[PDB]
């Protein structure tokens, strides 16, 4: 069989999680899926390590997934090095596991259901694209992610055929004491009809709170901004311009359960192909005591497997870096009010949006 | 005539040659590739490039 | 950086220099002004060189302050220095 | 109040030490140090971590070098484990670049600047001695990428940059297929930016390619002249060396003051809460452990054993100097000083590979070329 | 002469709170002279606006 871990923390509706388990139709795979769920609340990074070691030592899993109610980071951090360790596969399909690290350990099999960086900064590209929107400004801080946003996006205009124009890269540093005049003087260069902007959900205020004493706020202005910045659509500090348009995941179309599915078909549908060519079920030692003189075996074999999983038509692929390649994108734009309400989506280079000629 | 002046160059400023024709026989511009919104050179233009 | 000086010198069909009109005082419409020293006195400049100097500067956004050569013309080495436009 | 200090520090031999430096600290409101040894396991580090914030309560943590020499993996939990409660984490002895971004690693200090901070000694160093054409060697994992990611856009103050960066893959054997592509380059000034282990694969390639002759220029890291590398490494390379990178005694001392002086500042604040008292009972995200953290990049220490101790925006070190090696007759020897801004030469000599005592000009301009006509009748 | 006007903006000083509105259809500007006809004590709060 298939050892299947599928961990909820918080309030979610568990009975429609072990639904999808047997609903899953795996006769003609013949995966076997052995799904053992355990539920408990955040509490502690230990309880993790408590329970993946115990159960790891229990049945022998060959796979984990993972779903959060909690937007902490840190939860992700903590399953990439416990699958460098335990070599077995993570997946962290919703909640703090979900949100994507800049780098990924090379021993770990931690995987995420979610878009990269430069995966967004691409769709950026495609939505403005069909408005004839082609004059850009860049606005970066020194977030780790400011190189790589801007990086892809200056190399996907250096040899296109539409009329693509970049006018200022300025990037800010407001880590220095009293940096009101030093920010203030640099976002007073902007001209663009359209700014990108890539900060942290506080650095949005404080960038949007003296982009308004600029007045870089006005009907003709657009700002295209990633999903790290929003974060929570619920929660607006009343300095968001009236028109602000961010990317995310498809979370409300998404459930729980839902993604559950696909955690499980995901892992299932590669351990089936490895037993009928490879043939070999990896069941790594037991006890996490003294793991470097475990490290004769290998777990490597199931790991390319799930690079490539198609389910359904849809092609569930992952990278080495664990973002999905073609995953769910929606695009948000502010209303009236201080709502964040859905304008279309973007999959597998077949961006459509419910909006057209745009106001 | 392009040759005879090539000769002048190598000689006046010391420098040896291989000449070779363009494998595409085209002169050189800027197209469209396979579907990918990327613009490629052909030609002298993308041989030098 | 972006306000240089630039030098000039009347030739016929590319340089054209002409006295300011009388009545305004100040130089023509689609004729840049362009100063003289003999102290210095405006003249209005226009010709074909001028009519692509606009063009450039207008593409390669940056302004100028024209102004008629005196040291002597287009350029000659005389005892290893330069002299006029050059 | 009792304030905890404790380290995960292997080598408990220098856990003797470490107890003094507290005893001074506390004069120069109490600071307690309850430092647990280092073992061999990485998963019970992440289970000991909370273990010793459960007894203690640690506000600030501190790990060092153990006995293992991958330096890759081992003080990852404690930086992954303290980041749950935002608890800074102190780099003793960690070089590498991974710990340099705050997306992983949110609240973590260091006392010795990475490998990859060795680039921007390199581009002092190659503007002292007027090199303008390098070759890059860089690997291609991360602690390559970020090496040359810093040579790149350090370059673009000259408005210049590498005539072509090569990346090869870690661990690999035949890399000469890759590097006599570089041979046919008008450069002669080679970088690398390789492990201990991958330093020696191009060492050895280069041996029988005939690089390491007269003309080349070779400069590397601390761990191209160290370990295995240096066996094989042919001799003239002008690599890099800090000057007391492994002195853990050295970096203890002055690591316990900076969070001394830094209990001083924490007295005077609002809103101060006390680590949590237990691990498994705790899951909040203590916003005292951000405000630790952030007055202590800030501070900036008058003194220390090895130095001034000041941090950077990502809270690695700052204008710290390195020692340059030069491989003489199998062996190294000191031939400049680096003073964090430029680099002073020793009065040694510098004895270039292949024995050039004068200085190659490190780039041969290629006078044959490869010239493209097309058919065109009267021309 | 090659004279041009390119704008003959109108500020209104009057409204309450509308220093973001006049914020706004100044940045229009862009003329290297701009002629301000105005009271010495409102060309301090339109100077530290165009600032």
Redesign the interface.
Known sequence: SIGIAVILVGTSDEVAIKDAHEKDDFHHLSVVPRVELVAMNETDPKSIITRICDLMSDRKIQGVVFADDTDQEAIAQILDFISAQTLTPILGIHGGSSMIMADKDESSMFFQFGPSIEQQASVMLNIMEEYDWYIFSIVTTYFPGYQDFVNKIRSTIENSFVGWELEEVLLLDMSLDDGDSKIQNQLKKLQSPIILLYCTKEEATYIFEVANSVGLTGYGYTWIVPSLVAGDTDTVPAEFPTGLISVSYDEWDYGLPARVRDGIAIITTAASDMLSEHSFIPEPKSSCYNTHEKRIYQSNMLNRYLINVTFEGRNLSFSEDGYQMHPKLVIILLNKERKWERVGKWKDKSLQMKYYVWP | FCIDLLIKLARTMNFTYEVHLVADGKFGTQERVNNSNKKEWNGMMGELL | DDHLSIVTLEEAPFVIVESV?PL?G?????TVPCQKRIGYIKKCCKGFCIDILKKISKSVKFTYDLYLVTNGKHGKKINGTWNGMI | KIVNIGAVLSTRKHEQMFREAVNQANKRIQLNATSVTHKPNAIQMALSVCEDLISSQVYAILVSHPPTPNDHFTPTPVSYTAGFYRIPVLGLTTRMSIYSDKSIHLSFLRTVPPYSHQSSVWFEMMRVYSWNHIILLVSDDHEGRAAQKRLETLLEERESKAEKVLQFDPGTKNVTALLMEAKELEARVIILSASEDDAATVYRAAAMLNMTGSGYVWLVGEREISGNALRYAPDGILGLQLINGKNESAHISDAVGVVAQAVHELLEKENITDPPRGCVGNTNIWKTGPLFKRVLMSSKYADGVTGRVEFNEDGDRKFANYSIMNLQNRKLVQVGIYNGTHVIPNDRKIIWPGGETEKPRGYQMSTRLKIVTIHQEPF
């Not at chain 3, 100040?26 to 689609?30: H, Q, S, Y």
Request: charged fraction near 30%.
């Open positions: 009109d305004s100040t130089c023509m419409r689609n």
